[PDB]
Amino acid sequence: HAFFKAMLFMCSGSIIHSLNDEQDIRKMGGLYKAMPFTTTALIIGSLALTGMPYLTGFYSKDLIIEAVNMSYTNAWALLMTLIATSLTAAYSTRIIFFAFLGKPRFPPLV
Amino acid sequence: GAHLARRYLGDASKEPDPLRMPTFPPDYGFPERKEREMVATQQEMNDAQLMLQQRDYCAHYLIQLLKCKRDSFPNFLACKHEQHDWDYCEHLDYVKRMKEFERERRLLQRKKRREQREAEMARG
Amino acid sequence: AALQAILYNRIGDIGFVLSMAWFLTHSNAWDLQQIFMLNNECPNMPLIGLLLAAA
Amino acid sequence: MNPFASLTLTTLTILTIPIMMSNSNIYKTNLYPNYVKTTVSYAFTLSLVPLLMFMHTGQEMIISNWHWMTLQTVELSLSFKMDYFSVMFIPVALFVTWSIMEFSMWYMHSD
Amino acid sequence: MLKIIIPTTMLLPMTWMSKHNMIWINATVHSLLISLISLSLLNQLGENSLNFSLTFFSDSLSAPLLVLTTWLLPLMLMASQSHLSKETTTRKKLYITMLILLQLFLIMTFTATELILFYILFEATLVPTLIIITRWGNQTERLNAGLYFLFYTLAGSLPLLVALVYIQNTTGSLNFLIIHYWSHPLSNSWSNIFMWLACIMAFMVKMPLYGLHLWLPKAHVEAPIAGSMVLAAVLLKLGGYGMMRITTILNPLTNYMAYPFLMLSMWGMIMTSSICLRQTDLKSLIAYSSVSHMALVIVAIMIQTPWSFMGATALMIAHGLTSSMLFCLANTNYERVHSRTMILARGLQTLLPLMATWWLVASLTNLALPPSINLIGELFIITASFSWSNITIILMGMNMMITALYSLYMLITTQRGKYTHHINNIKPSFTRENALMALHILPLLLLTLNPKMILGPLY
Amino acid sequence: VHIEPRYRQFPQLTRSQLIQAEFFSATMWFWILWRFWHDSDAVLGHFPYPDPSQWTDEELGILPDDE
Amino acid sequence: SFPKYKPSRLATLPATLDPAEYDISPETRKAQAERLAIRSRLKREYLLQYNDPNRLGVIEDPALIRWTYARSANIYPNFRPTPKTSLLGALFGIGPLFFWYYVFKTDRDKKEKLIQEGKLDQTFNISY
Amino acid sequence: SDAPPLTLEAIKDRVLYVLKLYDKIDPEKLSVNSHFMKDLGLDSLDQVEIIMAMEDEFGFEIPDIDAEKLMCPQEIVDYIADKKDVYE
Amino acid sequence: SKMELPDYKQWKIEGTPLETVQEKLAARGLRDPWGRNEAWRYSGGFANNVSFVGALLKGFKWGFAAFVVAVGAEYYLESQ
Amino acid sequence: SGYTPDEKLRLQQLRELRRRWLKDQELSPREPVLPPRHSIFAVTHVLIPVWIIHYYLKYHVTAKPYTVVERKPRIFPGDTILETGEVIPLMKEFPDQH
Amino acid sequence: AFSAPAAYLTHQQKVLRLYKRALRHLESWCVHRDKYRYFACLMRARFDEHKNEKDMVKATQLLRQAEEEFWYGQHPQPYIFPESPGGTSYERYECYKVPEWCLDDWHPSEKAMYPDYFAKREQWKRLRRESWEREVKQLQEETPPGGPRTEALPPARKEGDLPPLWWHIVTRPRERPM
Numbered sequence A: 001h002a003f004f005k006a007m008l009f010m011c012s013g014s015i016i017h018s019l020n021d022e023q024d025i026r027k028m029g030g031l032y033k034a035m036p037f038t039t040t041a042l043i044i045g046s047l048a049l050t051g052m053p054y055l056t057g058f059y060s061k062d063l064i065i066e067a068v069n070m071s072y073t074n075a076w077a078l079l080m081t082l083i084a085t086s087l088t089a090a091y092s093t094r095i096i097f098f099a100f101l102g103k104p105r106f107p108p109l110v
Numbered sequence B: 001g002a003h004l005a006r007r008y009l010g011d012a013s014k015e016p017d018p019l020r021m022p023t024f025p026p027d028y029g030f031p032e033r034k035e036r037e038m039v040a041t042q043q044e045m046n047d048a049q050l051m052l053q054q055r056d057y058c059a060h061y062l063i064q065l066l067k068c069k070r071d072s073f074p075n076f077l078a079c080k081h082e083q084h085d086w087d088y089c090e091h092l093d094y095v096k097r098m099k100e101f102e103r104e105r106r107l108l109q110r111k112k113r114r115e116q117r118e119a120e121m122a123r124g
Numbered sequence C: 001a002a003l004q005a006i007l008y009n010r011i012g013d014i015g016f017v018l019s020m021a022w023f024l025t026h027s028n029a030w031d032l033q034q035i036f037m038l039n040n041e042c043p044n045m046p047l048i049g050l051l052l053a054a055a
Numbered sequence D: 001m002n003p004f005a006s007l008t009l010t011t012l013t014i015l016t017i018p019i020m021m022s023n024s025n026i027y028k029t030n031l032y033p034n035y036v037k038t039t040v041s042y043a044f045t046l047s048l049v050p051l052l053m054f055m056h057t058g059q060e061m062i063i064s065n066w067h068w069m070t071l072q073t074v075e076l077s078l079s080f081k082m083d084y085f086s087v088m089f090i091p092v093a094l095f096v097t098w099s100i101m102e103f104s105m106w107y108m109h110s111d
Numbered sequence E: 001m002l003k004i005i006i007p008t009t010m011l012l013p014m015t016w017m018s019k020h021n022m023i024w025i026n027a028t029v030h031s032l033l034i035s036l037i038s039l040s041l042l043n044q045l046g047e048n049s050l051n052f053s054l055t056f057f058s059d060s061l062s063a064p065l066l067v068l069t070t071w072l073l074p075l076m077l078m079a080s081q082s083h084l085s086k087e088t089t090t091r092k093k094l095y096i097t098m099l100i101l102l103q104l105f106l107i108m109t110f111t112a113t114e115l116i117l118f119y120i121l122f123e124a125t126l127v128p129t130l131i132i133i134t135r136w137g138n139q140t141e142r143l144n145a146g147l148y149f150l151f152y153t154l155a156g157s158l159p160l161l162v163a164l165v166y167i168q169n170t171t172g173s174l175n176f177l178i179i180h181y182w183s184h185p186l187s188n189s190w191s192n193i194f195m196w197l198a199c200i201m202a203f204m205v206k207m208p209l210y211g212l213h214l215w216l217p218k219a220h221v222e223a224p225i226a227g228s229m230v231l232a233a234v235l236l237k238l239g240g241y242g243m244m245r246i247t248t249i250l251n252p253l254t255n256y257m258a259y260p261f262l263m264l265s266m267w268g269m270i271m272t273s274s275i276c277l278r279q280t281d282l283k284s285l286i287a288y289s290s291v292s293h294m295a296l297v298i299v300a301i302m303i304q305t306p307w308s309f310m311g312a313t314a315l316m317i318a319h320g321l322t323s324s325m326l327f328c329l330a331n332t333n334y335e336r337v338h339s340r341t342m343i344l345a346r347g348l349q350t351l352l353p354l355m356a357t358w359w360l361v362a363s364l365t366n367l368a369l370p371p372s373i374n375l376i377g378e379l380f381i382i383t384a385s386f387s388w389s390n391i392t393i394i395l396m397g398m399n400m401m402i403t404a405l406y407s408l409y410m411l412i413t414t415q416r417g418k419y420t421h422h423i424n425n426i427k428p429s430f431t432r433e434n435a436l437m438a439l440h441i442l443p444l445l446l447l448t449l450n451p452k453m454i455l456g457p458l459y
Numbered sequence F: 001v002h003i004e005p006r007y008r009q010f011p012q013l014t015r016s017q018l019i020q021a022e023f024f025s026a027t028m029w030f031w032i033l034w035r036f037w038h039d040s041d042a043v044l045g046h047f048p049y050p051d052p053s054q055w056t057d058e059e060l061g062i063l064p065d066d067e
Numbered sequence G: 001s002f003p004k005y006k007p008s009r010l011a012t013l014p015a016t017l018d019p020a021e022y023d024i025s026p027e028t029r030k031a032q033a034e035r036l037a038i039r040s041r042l043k044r045e046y047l048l049q050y051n052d053p054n055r056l057g058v059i060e061d062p063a064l065i066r067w068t069y070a071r072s073a074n075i076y077p078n079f080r081p082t083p084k085t086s087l088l089g090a091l092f093g094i095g096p097l098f099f100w101y102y103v104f105k106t107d108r109d110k111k112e113k114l115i116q117e118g119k120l121d122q123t124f125n126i127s128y
Numbered sequence H: 001s002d003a004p005p006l007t008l009e010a011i012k013d014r015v016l017y018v019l020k021l022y023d024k025i026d027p028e029k030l031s032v033n034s035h036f037m038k039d040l041g042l043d044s045l046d047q048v049e050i051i052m053a054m055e056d057e058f059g060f061e062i063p064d065i066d067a068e069k070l071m072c073p074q075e076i077v078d079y080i081a082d083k084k085d086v087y088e
Numbered sequence I: 001s002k003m004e005l006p007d008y009k010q011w012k013i014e015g016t017p018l019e020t021v022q023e024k025l026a027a028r029g030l031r032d033p034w035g036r037n038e039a040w041r042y043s044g045g046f047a048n049n050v051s052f053v054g055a056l057l058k059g060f061k062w063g064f065a066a067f068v069v070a071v072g073a074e075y076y077l078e079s080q
Numbered sequence J: 001s002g003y004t005p006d007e008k009l010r011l012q013q014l015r016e017l018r019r020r021w022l023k024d025q026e027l028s029p030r031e032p033v034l035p036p037r038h039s040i041f042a043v044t045h046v047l048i049p050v051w052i053i054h055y056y057l058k059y060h061v062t063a064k065p066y067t068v069v070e071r072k073p074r075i076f077p078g079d080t081i082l083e084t085g086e087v088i089p090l091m092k093e094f095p096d097q098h
Numbered sequence K: 001a002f003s004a005p006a007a008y009l010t011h012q013q014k015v016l017r018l019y020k021r022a023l024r025h026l027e028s029w030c031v032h033r034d035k036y037r038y039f040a041c042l043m044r045a046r047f048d049e050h051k052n053e054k055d056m057v058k059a060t061q062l063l064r065q066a067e068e069e070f071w072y073g074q075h076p077q078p079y080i081f082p083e084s085p086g087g088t089s090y091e092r093y094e095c096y097k098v099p100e101w102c103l104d105d106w107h108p109s110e111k112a113m114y115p116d117y118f119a120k121r122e123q124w125k126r127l128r129r130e131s132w133e134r135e136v137k138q139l140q141e142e143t144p145p146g147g148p149r150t151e152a153l154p155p156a157r158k159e160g161d162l163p164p165l166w167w168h169i170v171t172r173p174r175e176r177p178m
């Protein structure tokens, strides 16, 4: 997790510095083309965070889910872990959709 | 899972309890049972320093896999057959455990069926 | 925010200090090796202290 | 002597050299961040080797190099545990820190 | 022991025969030399103490306190000479004479073999402190503060005198060696209970114990900088040293006579730490923090374990150094702006960066950051209390949290934010002030390398 | 590499950043495909899951309820 | 119409939700003018000293001195022994002391009586 | 580095740009000193919208107490120049 | 250096969702006087943007081509 | 609506003064009047520190018992010991369910 | 920030401030520009529905109902400009602001560097010292006997006069002082 979480903060910081120290995603428009390398890095980090197979996050997160499923464990904890696994992809999709897709929403001076 | 739904919603008296199991003798329904054997000795596992939880009946394949990892260190992709053998032996052990679970469940169900049925035959 | 972080970390540090005191009082050591040897069946107090520190 | 202990302690030791030089002239110039980044990168590439030794033979060690104080039956010593956890976490942390300081050289340029 | 006492006495004619413009230089140089000489007492034998003669002896408990006093005198002189520049030569010499007399009484107090001599010197320390507070204090409340400081001490100390003469009559001696070797248990009786109280309450009020601590904020706030330095660093430790010396003959009664004092100390350390969170005066916060630390020391002494005494000794030394540094730091800003209110001057880090670094280090040592000796003593005391009872950890952790809270609150309020606009007389830090802070802080960090020097006889 | 603001127009792009981003995205996808070609068992599973209902009572050792 | 917002101690009432600022009378306007005049006079008095080239030092604020004096020195002269004051003082002073005495005494009595039984598992406890 | 320092000419040009992109104002008619209420026949809501558009343009908020009195483009230019310390 | 603003005449709301907003408002009797200020966000290089699934599949073509080349090499190499 | 004449006049006066001050904060071309090897890093920051530590560990730390403690290496069947020349026998002839 | 406040806000000022707050919070809710523009024109129409009301009581009641609606329907996380009192960069550069009087305490060796700057600073100090008395006299002249009524200050009215109380307004450190 160290690798891609550091990368995600790094991409967020590059985006913030490019858009005049702005951190609200509502004023972040279409950076998929304006910031290609940052977009690629953030997409790769989001896929690693969501447990895409054979990435960095796969080899640990999917094994963790497998072991949680096959253990004498609290049922509520298992259900909450699964719901958190849903929400992980949920906010990753939120970040990508609001920060990199659509039309620009930042001030005109690029 | 279906077993959890059967135990928690249906009659739990008809479902095995994982904590206290098996409750029946190991030679109850079998005429003769063969004792499970070991390939790796206590001293071999003590010298290999596997772990107290990895010293199961699959420990010999683990010893082979660890040795082959150690000899072929720079090529970390060369120990495929040993890993496959260890995984297969672990899968066989897990299947044996599932067989034990199903055997306990069926034995308990048959015992309950037969004892209430003999009680029903005796009450009339 | 810095003071908030300090406050929460000291809340956990309470449990850290509890774990240290229990381990010194019952195992006569602070080092990892002695603690493992002398605690075959670890009681709840040091583990709850460590859990509070981790939280 | 086994190089494992010496390399593991050197990886930690060389990180303190810029802290000692913080009072030197290099701290007053604009070359200090690059110097710190290079030091961290050298620490990472040095820590890579004990990781290889562990990945080969599973070498683990503890080093009680310095005795600090003894209270009755209890001895307090500067001791380092160099098991799998340490030898795996040190290179990852050094790698991440190297990348983040190289990033900081640009992000915090006007500070 | 005369090799320490005689130069300290020689400090008096030397400063009375000096030129009008050389008194500070001469006094500082020879005080530093005397501290260097006194540093040789740290070589301790282990088994028993160093018995120089019938009158004086040195212990592993006494030696760090003696070194701390001898080291504190030059720092007091360095801090004093700024605000005394307009004074006449005779009055400056009188002030230095007061400081030298206080040092002499302190060094003789910590080495006396017999309890009546200890009592005589321990009372004799009152007069120079009272004169300093009531003559060179700045405000009009210094008179009330001096009255409180004198009478709180004496009301506890007189019963100690009665108890000491009674004990010498009944036993035949008060020499500490004979007292220790011929110790007999105290029975469970009202007479023994009141003897215990008469032997304990004077040292209780000198710590001070919570509920008897009201004199300390007045005296420590209203005194000049040197007076506050000596009150916090050294004079508070007289009670702890007296307790460690006197509880040898109080067993087995202390087993239950200590319950109200332990309860008072724990709850009052919580109370004073909480009080520090709402304080408008910068010196009162430091005073109340001193009260909390001395409450922890009182608990350590009351529980009567080797780890407790070791932690108590370490905490006494560390608290003395840290409190002196904090008082000097507050005094610098007071000299700048002529007011003790904390929120008057803000954002001083923008104007004084090195003084801000000194503030940060002092605040970090006040909250007992590892591996400083402050946390060494505090952790040893906390472990001893946990052995005494596992429920003490709740109060210890609460006190730790509140201590970190008000320490960082003081640091943030004084150093961070934006500067006050109308205040425009904040000059750059002088060499004297920075040197004083460095001379406070460097021994603290150097003692970490050799913690056994301040852990005491039980080591 | 000197890039100037453009005021309501798409920012100026250099070839190096575009080719690097495309190369690394292609590298990620190629790695995923190569792994799935060589280690498909890690995702799809390797050993079959037995069905407990397919087990006879002779191999499981239970009597036919009459003894 | 819409659900109503109710204020409390730690979440006060917004100005736009205050009926007082929407029910205005000429005396309210006069009060606002008086408050503004007081503020303006204080601001002028402060700014005449703030911008003075001659002035060097800290400009003393009477209000801060009043606040500190009231919080520190004026409290005891205005104290009266009252049933409220007496009860609160007794509670907050001696209640916690007796509570902690009871807790610690009970715990230590249990521990000592359990020691006398020979059952505490004190193995390896050589440091105290 | 960061963005180049702002200049008076750029501020005035950008203000006139934003005002010429407004529909209720004639491009030819508009001038730097053109009053909003008097010359362009606008009301208070249009002035509020103009202030909000200026904030969106320059990426900073103008307090309502100060925005109330910006009734010509020159006043807006002066306010922006004085706030961001633009002197030439 | 010393750039200048483009012509303000080009910013037109036709062909953009601002035109749809304008016609839906005219269906109500209202008008939007701020569309030409917002038109630049749709006019130029920001005219077309990819979708989420297409953004996740950024370098799929090149990677797939390389993977096919590699597997064909494996097909043709182990025959020796 | 808008400023009063006094407000605007004072604002433009203050604007002129402030712009003059900001112009005056600007530096002349001479203002900072100052009064009057390839592998050096790798030999002083890596090689020297490891020389001291290796010497410190080899001759001082390892001169006392139980200071540097290594967990003993793992032994598997078929291994050969370096000291005694021992050979560990193989491990019981697997059933070989190939 | 720059203008002296009044004793109270008129109904018109409150109405405009509510309009601006509602527009900003609607923009926070409506992320996209076209949807925000559509709903902003709808808000403007609903706002102009009662533009020409003559009964002050019903106008006040409409204002109160609108404020209640805004409070119930406000965005819990409205967009804030970074330098605004709620922004992520509000007081970021306050630690870099050093008052100008600190330059007088500089060592002469420090002032050996930067000679022209300090000569011009001497010029500014002479200007302030030569204008202060006239500033005080003008403030005394133009003030009612019962003290000032507002926080407004008069401009300069003579030939070589400077507006009173100008030093600490003109000599602000900067917005990005370092």
Ligand SMILES: CCCCCCCCCCCCCCCCCC(=O)OC[C@H](COP(=O)([O-])OCC(O)COP(=O)([O-])OC[C@@H](COC(=O)CCCCCCCCCCCCCCCCC)OC(=O)CCCCCCCCCCCCCCCCC)OC(=O)CCCCCCCCCCCCCCCCC
Pocket (backbone or CB within 6 Å): E210, E211, E264, G081, G082, G083, G086, G087, G089, G090, G091, G092, G093, G094, G095, G098
């Ligand atoms: C080191 C840490 C810090 C330690 C130090 C800090 C804390 C300790 C020191 C400070 C706090 C202690 C203060 C002591 C009380 C001082 C009273 C005083 O100065 O009055 C002068 C002051 C001036 O006299 P004045 O101007 O001639 O009189 C005009 C009055 O103002 C006109 O007033 P009025 O006519 O409206 O009202 C007067 C009237 C009506 O008064 C009232 O309306 C209020 C009711 C007051 C009396 C009953 C209390 C009612 C509420 C609580 C009831 C008890 C609850 C259970 C307590 C235990 C719970 C386990 O008085 C009564 O009816 C009282 C009759 C007595 C019935 C109950 C007697 C109970 C004795 C104590 C029981 C609790 C023992 C402790 C248990 C601890 C367990 C761990 O008189 C008062 O204004 C106060 C009168 C009420 C006094 C009530 C005291 C209750 C507090 C507990 C006292 C026990 C502690 C002292 C031990 C020694 C006792 C012999």
Ligand SMILES: CCCCCCCCCCCCCCCCC[C@@H](O)O[C@H](CO[C@H](O)CCCCCCCCCCCCCCC)COP(=O)(O)OCC[N+](C)(C)C
Pocket (backbone or CB within 6 Å): E188, E189, E190, E193, E210, E211, E212, E257, E260, E261
């Ligand atoms: C603000 C801070 C000030 C400083 C605080 C100082 C604290 C001093 C308190 C002293 C601690 C306890 C004193 C004596 C120990 C026990 C006291 C007594 O209550 O215990 C019982 C004693 O029984 C009765 O309680 C007798 C005492 C009753 C009379 C005392 C009045 C207490 C009221 C509180 C007044 C406040 C005192 C402090 C004033 C400031 C035990 O029963 P018993 O085993 O049979 O007697 C043992 C003694 N023998 C062996 C000689 C027979």
Ligand SMILES: CCCCCCCC/C=C\CCCCCCCC(=O)O[C@H](COC(=O)CCCCCCC/C=C/CCCCCCCC)COP(=O)(O)OCCN
Pocket (backbone or CB within 6 Å): E151, E152, E153, E154, E155, E156, E159, E162, E163, E166, E190, E191, E192, E194, E195, E197, E198, E199, E201, E202, E205, E212
């Ligand atoms: C500033 C605040 C500090 C207050 C501290 C005051 C408390 C001091 C402790 C009590 C003082 C008196 C102690 C007397 C000296 C002890 C000597 C002794 O032990 O003699 C006793 C004598 O014991 C007494 O006489 C004690 C009676 C008490 C006299 C004065 C009472 C005043 C109030 C006492 C309680 C308060 C003390 C603690 C309160 C602390 C502060 C609140 C027995 O002698 P014999 O007669 O020979 O008996 C054996 C042969 N039959």
Ligand SMILES: CCCCCCCCCCCC(=O)SCCNC(=O)CCNC(=O)[C@H](O)C(C)(C)COP(=O)(O)O
Pocket (backbone or CB within 6 Å): H043, H044, H045, K011, K012, K013, K015, K016, K021, K022, K023, K025, K026, K027, K029, K046, K047, K050, K051, K052, K053, K059, K062, K063, K066, K067, K069, K070, K071, K073, K074, K075
């Ligand atoms: C996103 C969530 C936000 C939603 C919150 C709810 C928003 C409010 C909804 C409806 C608000 C109203 O109708 S509010 C009722 C409005 N009616 C009046 O104000 C009557 C008197 N008019 C005047 O005094 C002036 O003409 C004036 C109008 C000030 C213009 O002034 P200029 O011409 O001189 O600029």
